[PDB]
Amino acid sequence: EGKLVIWINGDKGYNGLAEVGKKFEKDTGIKVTVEHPDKLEEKFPQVAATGDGPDIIFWAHDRFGGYAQSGLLAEITPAAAFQDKLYPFTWDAVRYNGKLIAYPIAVEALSLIYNKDLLPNPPKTWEEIPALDKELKAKGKSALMFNLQEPYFTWPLIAADGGYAFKYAAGKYDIKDVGVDNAGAKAGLTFLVDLIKNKHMNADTDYSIAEAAFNKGETAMTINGPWAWSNIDTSAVNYGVTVLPTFKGQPSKPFVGVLSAGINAASPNKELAKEFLENYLLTDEGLEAVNKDKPLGAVALKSYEEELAKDPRIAATMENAQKGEIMPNIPQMSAFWYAVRTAVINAASGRQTVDAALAAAQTNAAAADKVAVMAAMARAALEMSLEEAAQYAVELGAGPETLKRIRQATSVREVAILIAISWYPENEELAKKVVDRVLLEH
């Protein structure tokens, strides 16, 4: 009750943070203890409400939505002048249900990485890349390889011309306003698919393949974040990082990850934690102390960010971050990530058109909650026998009509579909797709 316990992941500068805490206690008499236990993101919701939980937790802002939803984080109330010390968009990442629930610390986003020896002038448009790839193919190399399997990496292009996950307005997300289906998203994914059809990229390329190719000097560009820089530092590739190419004259919009510090709603040192975070850590001195231990990348503090941005790599990370889309912190993002992923993997390989792929991912993401209910039911029911699944229908309060259909059903798959439709009779084919998805995974 007179100490601060701070949890931060092992891959961060926890020792520099501890040096901030020793400066703290030299000024204050309040001892500060920085720990870095494994799985702290999973441990915190289990220990927070009760004793032995940390006063301050550092993690990417997207988990803090879950913490705040369950009441584990204090609402923080920084004065106007302190808020104006950080970039305004970074405060939008630590907003949950109209209330601020963390301090922004660091900012992370994808950038365009390029081999200065192969390509001292990287293209500013995606439209340039086909001819550039044609030119470099005559020399035995390719223009651009990045991970096409994960929608995090392909979303910058897809979103460029107008796509988005959920609409953010007035500090809130509208879970029914999804931008996976609009004209801009379609145009970006169409351009990607065309890059593949013309053999400027391979639909099979994943993270390890892209990183191996770029780090061995086989391709002139990749798309990646600061977490990869160290592997390039050891690779003997003279590389730079810069703003991502534009598409139809609009910036690519990568997702933004904001390392944030929350205050445990059960901490008895909330005022001490506020004083440590505001008066000691979020200063040039404290952020530099953390940064010298392990680099923060781009930083939410304006004064310190403009000192860091003398490195063009950090300046690029921050520029892409300001042109991008804050990662929504809401649980419906789950349905986004699966759906969009399927979509682009199906469009890149020619199994669905882009129109059909994105139409499916749009209906899924707009119906995130119904999908979660149907998929949880399906996961349960598909492990039962036909008889047990029928009894399960009875225990779920199924009406007599669907009960009669269910006793006529010949397989547990059919029963799961009938249950899902008894709950959501207006989305038959979505129910079929969800049950078949769960079947595919087991």
Automatic annotation (TrEMBL):
Top-rank taxon, per record: Bacteria
**Protein name listed in UniProt:** Maltose-binding periplasmic protein,PigG
Question: Which species is the source of this protein?
Answer: Serratia sp. (strain FS14)
Included stretch of the parent chain: 6 to 372 of 468
